[PDB]
């Protein structure tokens, strides 16, 4: 690739918080949070509300509402 | 489904366009270069008669060895220059074969120049 034209690119771990499922891939989201990975190096983490392993269409199961959500507050009521 | 182009065919179209304007004479024969994924070949051709005068390839046992392709191109240039000088040829026109004048082709040409072929 040419130098100085492309946006900054780096490895990141997308973490589906619903299932606490982590997947490594490149992106340019540059989250401050850092986490360790099975390889010795550590890369920043991108929080993700819904993912392939959590979406109902992909999974075949009903999705689980997250904490502090609308459903949780409604049930607390 | 996406096709893959034939690099040699593209190369040959370019070479034909080069050769409309570039041709080799008995006094100033054409130094032609052919390049493969592994080897590089050089000929000296008189186009009026359609006869080769000298030949040298990186695939030849005399030149064949373990070296980078650019070093092998240098060796082929030196060899073809020496054989042309032995046959009594100084002035030639360099036919880059439709390849860009760069890298291996360029190294071969510069080797021939240094070996004493006058372009």
């Amino acid at each position: 690739m040419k130098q100085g034209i492309h946006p900054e690119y780096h490895q990141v771990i997308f973490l589906d918080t619903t299932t606490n499922f982590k997947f490594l891939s490149g992106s340019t989201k540059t989250s401050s949070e850092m986490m360790e990975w099975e390889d010795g190096k550590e890369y920043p983490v991108i929080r993700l509300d819904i993912s392939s392993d959590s979406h109902p269409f992909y999974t075949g199961r009903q999705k689980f509402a997250a904490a502090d959500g609308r459903v949780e507050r409604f049930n607390k009521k | 489904m996406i096709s893959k182009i034939d690099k040699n065919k593209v190369r040959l179209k370019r070479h034909a366009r080069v050769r409309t304007n570039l041709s080799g004479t008995a006094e100033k024969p054409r130094l032609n270069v052919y390049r493969s994924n592994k080897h590089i070949y050089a000929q000296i051709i008189d186009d009026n008669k359609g006869v080769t005068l000298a030949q040298a390839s990186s695939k030849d046992s005399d030149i064949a060895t373990t070296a980078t392709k650019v070093e092998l191109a240098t060796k082929v240039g030196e060899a073809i220059a020496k054989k042309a000088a032995d046959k009594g040829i100084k002035e030639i026109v360099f036919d880059r074969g439709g390849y860009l004048y760069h890298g291996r082709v360029k190294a071969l040409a510069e080797a021939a120049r240094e070996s004493g072929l006058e372009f």
Partner: protein, 176 residues
Amino acid sequence: NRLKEKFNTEVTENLMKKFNYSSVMEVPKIDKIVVNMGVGDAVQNSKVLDNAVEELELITGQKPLVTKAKKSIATFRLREGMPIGAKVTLRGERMYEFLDKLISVSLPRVRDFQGVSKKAFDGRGNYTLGVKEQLIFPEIDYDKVSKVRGMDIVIVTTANTDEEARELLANFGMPF
């Protein structure tokens, strides 16, 4: 390169066994991914095209090529040479990263998602997916999105048939 490793290990073997290829060189692979955004309203406001280019660059990771009108059209008020689109070509590791990201992080963010069209094959082993909201992609913050616009993602494969392309994309994990 998790997706590339999956292709090398599992998808290759599955597809080869399914289609009885005498040689490994017959195994289809995803040649490239072209992400195109056609901005016809750039005729009226070039800033829209600039924003589209910025968003596409953020999504893809590399600077897009600006595509200009091939011919002049009176009805669209389009003059030849006016930039009316953006396009990015992804190959290799960047392509695979974008593909897995699209499959996993991006696609499920579609409201009322029910899978992607299984008939969106050109007829020769290439698949075109029409996304309708840039906001799908994780790299874009809805605050900075002045306008919402879609994209065409063309996955160009070496498969000679729609059946083989479908098998390859399914093994990769494409919903349908």
